[model samples]
Target chain A: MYLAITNIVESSFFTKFIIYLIVLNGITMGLETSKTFMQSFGVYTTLFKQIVITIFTIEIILRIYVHRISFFKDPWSLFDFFVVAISLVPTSSCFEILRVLRVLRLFRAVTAVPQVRKIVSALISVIPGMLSVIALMTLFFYIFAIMATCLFGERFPEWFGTLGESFYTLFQVMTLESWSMGIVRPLMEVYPYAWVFFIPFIFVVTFVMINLVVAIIVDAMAILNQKEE
Target chain B: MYLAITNIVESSFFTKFIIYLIVLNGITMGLETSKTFMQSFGVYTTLFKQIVITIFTIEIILRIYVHRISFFKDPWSLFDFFVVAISLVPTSSCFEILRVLRVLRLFRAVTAVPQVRKIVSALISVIPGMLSVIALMTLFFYIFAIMATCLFGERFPEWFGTLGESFYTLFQVMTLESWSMGIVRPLMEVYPYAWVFFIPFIFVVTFVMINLVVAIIVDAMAILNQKEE
Candidate 1:
């Protein structure tokens, strides 16, 4: 009977059913966000939400029962367990935010689908390199912020008066958002040599970012290449 | 004598010298943008600009002399030729934009550097795939725009009254810029079920963009892999 339960839980039909329930829950919760919809169908949505949560809870229990300690070993399984755990939070005053927590239940699709799992793993594998690039970018922002504050602080106090302000403005520049006509062009008016600073800064930041992305791509391909070999 | 000239034009020192001149010209042109700097050193900069243009013209002539018909065969050479040609435009009323065109001459660095050339070629290679992705995005935008305009046009005319406005707002959403706070949240205030239209739209568009980027990366790696073989 235990083996039969495990087989039923692992069946393709069960997985598809869960995915459909998740999609349905997402639709109902989204409707609940609207006052008018809540006025009309709140009872039905609430009842259905409870039903799906109970079903999800049973699914988690059956899996945990079957795998026991091994179920906690797989990180995806752990993520699935936690996502399901959040839905179990009592829907009382103290746990009012559980409804919000339930919204994230849709993300379990990542664990449910094999292809999405593979893509997510590929993305996760690049985090270490991305962190390094981020660190380098932070260092650059710090150095540039200091320079900007010193050079333009006297004139453009709002943009470069404080290190934090300079950091924010520089980030805006990095995004190429209003950097030219909004920030840099006005800046060039006062400091004829401002472009000398900002142009190179943009180039350096963009180059580093492009390199980081290319590295992730190459690394992802390398993983696939090794798998093929 | 012609052979000697060809050898000189093909030499490393000549290439590096041209790159340096391009840099210097870029600096002078950048300085020319500042009225104060122009007031102080207008004569010197104008004279230097003329000298650099002459030097660039001579370089192109020499290149054409060596390669002849083959000079136009290379896209980069044609680019260099046209860039130099722009500088020869008469600085008169009808040709005020020539000054703007000369700024693009700085891109000569791409042709001057082999590594940058290779990188640019790799980027160019992905254009076909990128175009297809762009076409698909356009379709998504069109469909969403029509739905948005039809559904929300009466209430949110500024954002969704017309197809073009809807297109613009949807683009803002695609950028994830002020989409929630500025556009969508305000939108949801009335439409309530707006997320039904938008949430999936964002996910679909972002997924497509990520796939496009991944394809470029994989294609780039495949090219590199082939070279290694």
Candidate 2:
């Protein structure tokens, strides 16, 4: 019976069916949330919610049955089970709102998709390189933020409101800001030699940081290729 | 003779030579830029700068000689030729700084590499799909920013100082701050039933966003494959 259940649960058809159901529930929930008038449909909402809960309970049971009791040893799997369990519990009080946990059902859906699993596995394999680049970027931004807070926080308090604000500004520098107007002009006005700070920052952030991100993606792609080989 | 010169200039050897010179110049410039004390070597700096300028002048002359007088019919080619000519003028102050245009020489390097050309073409083909998704995301973020500012700007002025700050905070929410306590806790506190908001935001941002991005990439990959066919 256990082997039979595992075989059924592991089938792509079963997984895809569950995904479709979950997507339908998500759409219904989204509609209910977005429409003020929909809030009044308490009967429909409760009925729909109960149906979703019932389907989810069946999903959890099938998953647990397929994987066995040892499946609970995996934290994510255990969390998935717990979320489904908690979401089904009826509570008279306001504090027992574990309906949010139902959102975690998305993880189960992701795990079911082979392509998503592959991409995620690739990402996981490249985490070290990504983390290192992230750490370096964090350090660079932190130092720049601190300096900006010290220099411009007083005069341009609205812009560089705090150290956090400075970091936010630095993030903008990576994406949207013009090199000359956004960074250089402001610094040059205060200190003529401020171009020195601006130049290095531009080179490191625009060139180095972007290349590091590209390198991580390329590394991940290489790992995927090797796995295929 | 003109046709011969044009053929010679367009030869693979000439392209390879240009690539080597640019790479060498890039390395030297990078090294020079990194050395704090090297700036004091005015003579060395002057010599290196002159060498770069000389190579750039030769490259321009070759390009013009190869293209013949008809090169002026193409606006971009004409623009390049004029810029190169202006930079060569010793009497013009603007010409003195025109050495900065040497960066445009990187475009010449691209023609020599088939793999780089493939990547560039792939990116170009992907632009429409990329732009559509980007446009959608921007619209979503823009409205969210306005809503967030109106709701939380007074309470969390530090983070939501203006619509722009709200936008920045929303961007952070989309990226690193997707699971941050600062956002989740506040929404939970403000509306006791805010789990409704929290659930969908988490679901859409984490799951739907990933799928959407993947879908865009897949569409682009299809276009790339079609081009190959």
Candidate 3:
């Protein structure tokens, strides 16, 4: 009986079926957001959510039982375990946030698909390579935010009066989110040489930072390829 | 005499001097934006501009003289030549836009610094690899924009009435620039399942596209490394 359960739980058909059920549950939860849909099928959707949550709970238990301690060893299995565990938590007044966790089970798609798992692993590996660049970026932001707060604080209090404000405003600038027409151009009318401060900041930070990330990603991928080989 | 001139112009000292001059000219133009600075030293700034532009013209002419037809063969040399040529065009009533062109000479910093040049070249090389991903992004944008206009046009005309508006709104969404609070949350109040459209769009377009770019960069860099070896 244990051997039969192990084989069944580990089958390709079981994994694919679980993925399809997760996607279906995701769609059902999404429909719950629409008042018209909910008015017509609220009972149905709620019943469906209950059914899937129970199935997910059973599926996780089966895996855990079959694999025992090994199930807890793999991070992906842990993730699946925790996600379903959260879903089983009774959704009471204090547990409203659990619904959000339930929604996150949609992300379990990554765990189910090996291709996605590899891609995510590759991206995560890039973080170590990117740490120094990120540190440099933070240092640049802190130094420039301080400078902006000092230089333009009196004139542009809303944007630069505090270090926090400077950081937020500079972040907007980094996004190129109306930085010119909204922020800098207006500031330029007053402090005409503002671009002298900003242009190079944009160059060194955004352009270089983005390229550095790409460079690090490239290096990480080469490492991944070598490891796989 | 030509040999003597060639030796002088091609020297390290000469190249460094030109880079310094370009930076100085950039500073001068930046200061020209300040009404206070320009008022106090308008004549001085004007004279400085003339001095630098004339010197730049001389520098390019000397380079052409030394390298002859070979000067025009190099893209960087052509960039230097054209920038100087644009600056030489007398800044008059009809040619106000030429001032913008003159400011672009600051980009010469890339040509001056070999390290910056290599970094830029690597970045540009990544572009060809990114083309298919870009095409994919555009296709997503167009299809989603069409769907958005069709679905939400009646309710949120401002954001989704026309293809253009949907495109712009979706672009803003992709940037994550005030996307939730400014756009989606409000839309959600009307159509709670709106996230079904937007969330997956974000996943496929932004997350996947970024990962695709990283993957391509990794592939391109490996190719670059092999070529260098």
Candidate 4:
């Protein structure tokens, strides 16, 4: 029964058929909830929402049936089941909030694919290295934030008034944009020779952190490759 | 003379001495320009800047002497030499702009260390995959931007008014921020199921792009490790 359901889910026809229903329901929901149209079709909106909930419930049941014992054996599978169950709750007040769980449903498709599964497993193996690098980077960022707060907190209260603001700048530097122009440019105008602090920070984060993370990922992938061979 | 210069440059003590001089120059320059009491000694700033430039000139000359034939043979070496020499031109009014090249000088330290050199080479090998993933993500962003602009441009002008705005929102989503709250919340208050467009957009960019990029990096890293071992 598990194999049969897996086969069905994996089939192109089933995937396409389900996707069509999802898209149709999604469109109908959009139109029905529009203020201009929703009032005209008051009952229609509730009816379509019920249909979508019913279909999603059946999908979840099929998923659980396919995995049977293994459904609860894997923690991620349990997470998926719980998320889908929460998404089905009829409590309208918090329904929109619970709808975010639908985002987690993508994990089911991810685990269903062998390549994605291997990559995720490889990433999991590298968690130790990632954590160490993250910890070191966080330490450096904290130190920088404290120093910046001490130096510029008075003048640039908005940017570095407190440790928290400094941290926000550091986070922006790490992920959003390059640190040099984003953070350093602002500092250089206010504090003479601020490049002394800014340049090394950029170097470590942009160059050293990048290389360290890449090295860890490479090592993890290597181990996985060897296991496969 | 070439051999003597090479020996001095290659010596650990000599490199440490240069690093110490750079640090001293950095500190003196910092104090001289700062609003603190040290600014009373204006002449010292000029003296320290000159000292730094003088040492940088000698260092470049020695690098050329040590790798004269090899340096001339390689285009990158010639480029490096040009960058250093151009920055040294007394007539150049934009020398401050060229001072940014000092950051590139750190690469000299990497070349001095074998382990760092190997790691850098390994990283260079993964560039193609990284670039490809970046390109694919950019393409995905543009595709979503067009769809989002078309769907929500008029309704949620703040978030999707133009292609650029839509692209920015998509970029935020790629980084796993549910910018939908920023974009869709107000509109949803008035048009509840504006969520159909918002949810799927977040799902594709955040979850799908994250998985795709991670898989690409892992695969690239595996190839790099195999080459290294």
Top-scoring candidate (lDDT): 1
**RMSD for each model, in Å, please?**
17.0, 17.1, 16.7, 17.8
Order by lDDT, highest first? 1, 3, 4, 2
Q: Candidate 3 on B1-229: residue-level lDDT in tens? A: 9789888997888777877776776777767778999999988888887787677777778787898886767776666666656545674554422434444545765566575655566566555435544655665675566556546767675887656777889998887676654775578678756656775676456655567767555654555566543
Candidates in order have lDDT scores of 0.68, 0.60, 0.66, 0.61
Off by over 4 Å in 4: A1-155, A161-168, A172-229, B1-17, B25-46, B54-122, B150-165, B189-194, B207-209, B212-229
Give per-residue CA lDDT, model 4, range A69-178, as digits (tens).
Answer: 75677776677577676565566675543433444444567686677777766766666545545655665665566556546656674776555667788667666453
Best by DockQ: 3
Candidate 1 per-residue lDDT, tens place, B17-77, comes to: 8777765665554344345787998898878877776776787787888988867667766
Clashing pairs in model 4, backbone N/Cα/C closer than 3 A: none
Quick one: ranking by DockQ, best first? 3, 4, 1, 2
How well docked is model 4, in DockQ terms? 0.05
Distance (Å) between predicted and true CA of A213, model 1?
2.2
lDDT for A166 in candidate 3 is: 81
User: What's each prediction's TM-score?
Assistant: 0.47, 0.42, 0.48, 0.45
User: Model 4 over residues B35-94: C-alpha lDDT tens digits?
Assistant: 453457667767767777777778778777787675688655666577666666766322
Order the candidates by TM-score, highest first — what do you get? 3, 1, 4, 2
- Model 2 ranges with Cα > 4 A deviation: A1-21, A33-42, A50-69, A72-121, A178-193, A224-229, B1-229
Worst 10 residues of 1 chain A by lDDT: A94-103
Candidate 3 at B185: error in angstroms?
Answer: 13
lDDT of 1 at A96: 31
